[PDB]
Amino acid sequence: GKNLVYSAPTSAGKTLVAELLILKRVLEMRKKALFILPFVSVAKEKKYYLQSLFQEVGIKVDGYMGSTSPSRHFSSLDIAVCTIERANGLINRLIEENKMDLLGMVVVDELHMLGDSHRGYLLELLLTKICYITRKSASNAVQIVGMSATLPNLELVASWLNAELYHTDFRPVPLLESVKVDHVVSLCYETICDNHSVLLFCPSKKWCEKLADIIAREFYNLHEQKELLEVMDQLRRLPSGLDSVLQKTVPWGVAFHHAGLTFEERDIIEGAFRQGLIRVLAATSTLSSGVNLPARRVIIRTPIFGGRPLDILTYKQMVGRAGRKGVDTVGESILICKNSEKSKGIALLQGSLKPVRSCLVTGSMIRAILEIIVGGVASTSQDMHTYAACTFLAASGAIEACVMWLLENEFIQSTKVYHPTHLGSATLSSSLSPADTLDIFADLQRAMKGFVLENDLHILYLVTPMFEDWTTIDWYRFFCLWEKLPTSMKRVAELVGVEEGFLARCVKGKVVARTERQHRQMAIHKRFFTSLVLLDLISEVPLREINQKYGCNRGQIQSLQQSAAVYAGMITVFSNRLGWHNMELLLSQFQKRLTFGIQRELCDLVRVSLLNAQRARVLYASGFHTVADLARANIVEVEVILKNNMRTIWVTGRKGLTEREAAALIVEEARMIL
């Protein structure tokens, strides 16, 4: 357990060493092992992979990723495939419960995210606690493992972690590069004739959908079917249905992939391409760091990605998906350029990824100081300086500025020893940023004086996150909705801060510039708009109806779903720890409702993993109002209800699943829950 850090190109079985190491450590020490992943999709996929590979050894595998969480305690778990933020929260609660010895390993995947990134600092602080706790209390207690592409400073990261080093550039499908004599039609025809796939990358969504249509149009003009029809049917019965352009583009082995689609549509398309049913896939920058989806030939439309050259870090992972290890001999990555873009293309072709930063007055240091002090591992100034040396910024004097910032905002109390009073303790358990916890405290306390219980809108407004611009708001449609709103919903609007004057300004006048810090009241109206969207969401109305009514597309609505559910859970824990029992009670149901977008009645029924929002309504309409009820039922009954040998449904991490034996697992899983 001397830790470890290694790097290797993707599509080279780099995770295999990690799987062997985790298997050995869990089997030997009988302690936990966190598999930290950057994204929720890759976390889901890895959780399914580890479940399949370790089910036959009595090893529980259930991670904390997105808004979801295991239906069993952390004690029973053996491997937790969590995301960075949720792994940080897990470690915080372990420290607070003084059960840190329960862990025996922490694997981290795609470690290059530690650098310039809006989540990397969470990984940095997450790893900084492990080394500190190990060195204060013993270096064989917790093994750390890492992965990445060719990092220029891999040795530096290993030195920070006190771990070994392994760096290599190997891949069974070598990539070639050579310029050889709009020259795209012939390329596509010759690449499709040889029975190989193509993965094209586009900078934007609209043009990504546009060109996919015309590629299929050329394939149609110049001219397995059963499996493509199967994918058609699987796409047809979805809460959002089948797209108008996708329905005509798919028949010709052409598809597109972007955040605009739903998670289910993305999963369907990824599965179709991986199986080889889809030959040409126009993806976007989102897929670059997405699930493992190798392709024979990668193509890049243009280095310009959002008014600037393509990120070099993104290009490496883009090219990594050029070559299938096991069926392919060689892989290619074509980067078309222009006269002005020739310089940018040659610049991007050469040169590896940039060095890793630390991103540590900054809110990250405030979070770190709060974590260590509330955790009870750094209470006095003498030791808090050692934490600074433990960081990756150090190994590569702002503590006092943050420590006073916390005392200024009453997060902690000085005594010389430091302690949290109530808000620091509640801020750490909620895994909320201490910067926003003051605003959250004010908004909750204000709510508990004049709360509105007629509808869920006042509860939704308080669990509505606005830390990112999840969508562009059309203020004319928002004004129309405001006009059509009921009075009950307008009372909460007045309570929160919405004013008809501001909406009148925005409906006709240009979007008011928020030049001044006092103009956070622009955020109030965006928050109210988002909360109305969330209300229509948990009301179980179809995504298309929410799209027409508000303008946000289904992919944005799903991202809002996940963010709102995560925020609702965080706020519920915040209220629980603060001693606000009524607020906690009102908030508790909402995390699951937001995760699944369901009504109160379906909440007890979506406990079965194999039950979507639609598949929970059909069973509820039939009469299965409870998982226990759904267990007591013949399989054929559920089969006929689902219908009212061919695979038509879709579930995350599925297999040869049809309407027949899908009903078999629904009842079987319900029995296990009981």
Q: Annotated binding site for ATP: which residue ranges?
A: 8-15
Please tell me the count of residues contacting ligand A1CER according to CB under 6 A: 22
Sheet holding 331-335, edge to edge: 175-176, 331-335, 297-300, 198-201, 280-283, 254-256
Could you say whether residue 370 binds a second copy (CB under 8 A)?
Answer: no
In the bound state with ligand A1CER, the residue whose beta carbon lies nearer, of 70 and 172, is 70
Least CB distance to ligand A1CER at residue 487 (A): 31
550-569 positions binding ligand A1CER, by CB under 6 A: 565-566, 569
Structure tokens that stand for 381 in this block: 């100034």
Q: Which amino acid is at 571?
A: I
Cα–Cα dist 130/371, whole Å:
13
How far does Cα 636 stand from its chain's mean position?
36
The binding site consists of 8-15
Element (H, E) at 331: strand 331-335
Among 1, 29, 69, 166, binds ligand A1CER (CB under 6 A): 69
Among 304, 448, 466, 651, binds a second copy (CB under 8 A): 448
Cβ 531 vs Cβ 495: under 8 Å: no
- What SS3 class is residue 20? helix
Cα separations (Å) of 544 from 175, 213, 557, 611, 615? 42, 22, 10, 21, 18
Cβ 116 vs Cβ 357: under 8 Å: yes
Among 102, 327, 621, 636, binds ligand A1CER (CB under 6 A): 102
Q: Which amino acid is at 528?
A: F
Among 28, 97, 400, 468, binds ligand A1CER (CB under 6 A): 97
Binds 163: which of a second copy, ligand A1CER, none (CB < 5-8 Å by kind): none
Cα separations (Å) of 81 from 93, 603, 669, 670? 16, 24, 21, 24
Binds 308: which of ligand A1CER, a second copy, none (CB < 5-8 Å by kind): none
Could you say whether residue 586 binds a second copy (CB under 8 A)?
Answer: yes
Least CB distance to ligand A1CER at residue 566 (A): 5
Sole window of 94-102, 474-482, 486-494, 657-665 interacting with ligand A1CER (rule: CB under 6 A): 94-102
Among 72, 99, 237, 385, binds ligand A1CER (CB under 6 A): 99
Cβ 496 vs Cβ 529: under 8 Å: no
Cα separations (Å) of 524 from 376, 436, 494, 507? 36, 14, 11, 16
CA atoms within 13 A on the CB side of 213: 12
Binds 74: which of a second copy, ligand A1CER, none (CB < 5-8 Å by kind): ligand A1CER
Could you say whether residue 431 binds ligand A1CER (CB under 6 A)?
Answer: yes
Among 188, 412, 447, 649, binds a second copy (CB under 8 A): 447
Least CB distance to a second copy at residue 494 (A): 11
Among 459, 627, 630, 642, binds a second copy (CB under 8 A): 459
Could you say whether residue 205 binds ligand A1CER (CB under 6 A)?
Answer: no
Binds 90: which of a second copy, ligand A1CER, none (CB < 5-8 Å by kind): ligand A1CER
Structure tokens that stand for 574 in this block: 């915040």
Q: Of 616, 625, 624, 632, which is closest to residue 668 (Cα–Cα)?
A: 632
Cβ 357 vs Cβ 240: under 8 Å: no
Query: Which residues make up the interface to ligand A1CER (CB under 6 A)?
Result: 64, 67, 69, 74-75, 85-86, 89-90, 93-94, 97, 99, 102, 430-431, 565-566, 569-570, 573, 591
* Binding-site ranges for a second copy (CB under 8 A): 447-454, 456, 459, 488, 491, 580-583, 585-586, 589, 600
